[PDB]
Ligand binder design. Structure first.
Ligand code: N7M
Ligand code: N7M
Ligand code: ZN
Length: 257
């Protein structure tokens, strides 16, 4: 099965998922001087006031905080997007060390972690249909640097002891994802893919310029999770990030000068 180890990590994925070598793969390096400011880009509209978180799940590759996506409760609109995209889950990718962990990079800089708020285009009815479409998903990516704690992350941090191993889930209601956002919603955008198998080329990536800061203790708690199931040999869930992929025939656009 695919993973992030020596024998099943990102360099092996193409053997089962040949789209890994496709034309619009993610993540990418964001070369900030080559990105083009597009004044026709609209501000992002993040409407999370009615969000309903339900559960948190260790899926063996990351942990997902899942939301009720059966109504337009937490939606992303505007920016480069046409129509309305519903929040289904968020998760993170992180490193074994503060010097690495993000999937996207900025002028080759790696951040300690990267948050992905995953949304699907309501015109396609559900997530499974949306991933089959070139405009099916919008993923809002937010970098994490280590410094001051992020108070809105602590509720996530504190439940991780309950989902240490693959397949464990826990109730996780009333979590407000607005507590994970930075001040500014300035962003870069480009067409790309899921960054894990099946690597489907269905994502409008929206990557925020401003990172959030989390404490060293917060990210250390991410690194105590396990990729394995309970009663299997323990392998720490760290370095669950795919490296930057070739940009190919793509231009990254910026919402800001
Ligand atoms: N990254 S990938 O192409 O999906 C892949 C799948 C299986 C493996 N190896 C495997 O299954 N070995 C048997 C031990 O469990 C390695 C990589
Ligand atoms: N890292 S990423 O490109 O944001 C990503 C998002 C969703 C998936 N797959 C998925 O099934 N998401 C919804 C889970 O219920 C895989 C990769
Ligand atoms: Zn992700």
């Amino acid at each position: 099965h695919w993973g992030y180890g020596k024998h099943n990590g990102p360099e092996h994925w193409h053997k089962d998922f040949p789209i890994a070598k496709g034309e619009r793969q993610s993540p990418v390096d964001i070369d900030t001087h080559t990105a083009k400011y597009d004044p026709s880009l609209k501000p992002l509209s993040v409407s999370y006031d009615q969000a309903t978180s339900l559960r948190i799940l260790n899926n063996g590759h990351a942990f997902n905080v899942e939301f009720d996506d059966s109504q337009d409760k937490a939606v992303l609109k505007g920016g480069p997007l046409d129509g309305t995209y519903r929040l289904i889950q968020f998760h993170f990718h992180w490193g074994s060390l503060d010097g690495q962990g993000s999937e996207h990079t900025v002028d080759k800089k790696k951040y300690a972690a990267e948050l992905h708020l995953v949304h699907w285009n309501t015109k396609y009815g559900d997530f499974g249909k949306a991933v089959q479409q070139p405009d099916g998903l919008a993923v809002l990516g937010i970098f994490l640097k280590v410094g001051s704690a992020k108070p809105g992350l602590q509720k996530v941090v504190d439940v991780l002891d309950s989902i240490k191993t693959k397949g464990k889930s826990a109730d996780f209601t009333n979590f407000d994802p607005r507590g994970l956002l930075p001040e500014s919603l300035d962003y870069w955008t480009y067409p790309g893919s899921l960054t894990t198998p099946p690597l489907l080329e269905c994502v409008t990536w929206i990557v925020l310029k401003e990172p959030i800061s989390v404490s060293s203790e917060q990210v250390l708690k991410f690194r105590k999770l396990n990729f394995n199931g309970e009663g299997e040999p323990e392998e720490l869930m760290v370095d669950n990030w795919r490296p930057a992929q070739p940009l190919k025939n793509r231009q990254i656009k910026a919402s800001f000068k």
